[PDB]
Design a protein around this ligand. Structure first.
Ligand code: FES
Ligand code: FES
Lengths: 69, 64
């Protein structure tokens, strides 16, 4: 009946987890976690697969690429 | 174990978004909470989510 947290474990000493990157620093491809289960947060490490299988969810990452380095 | 995404595009078995930086404006704010009405962009819905659940999630920002 009570709504669940999305992030169970990550950096709980931080009252609001925000990441901010400059485009100029970006790699050719970055894969960012939107499931809060990655062990390498804020990057996606495939943990969303286990999460989706265990919970029936359908979440996946955000991919940011550069057309040119 | 509870789902994270409650309502967004449930006919897609795994929601992935991919963008090229050259297409972006000087600032893009991406939702990591699956509560935005403008998903995949952040509309501030994370604030209510954090308030109601005690969570601490927030967006990912790509800026110039
Ligand atoms: S590990 Fe979280 S979206 Fe892939
Ligand atoms: S609305 Fe989801 S992270 Fe801001």
């Amino acid at each position: 009946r009570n709504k669940a947290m999305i992030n169970l474990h990550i950096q709980k000493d931080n009252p609001k987890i925000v990441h901010a990157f400059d485009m100029e620093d970006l790699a050719a491809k970055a894969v960012y976690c939107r499931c809060w289960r990655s062990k390498k947060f804020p990057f996606c490490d495939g943990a969303h697969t286990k999460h989706n299988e265990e919970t029936g969810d359908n979440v996946g990452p955000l991919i940011i690429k550069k057309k040119e380095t």
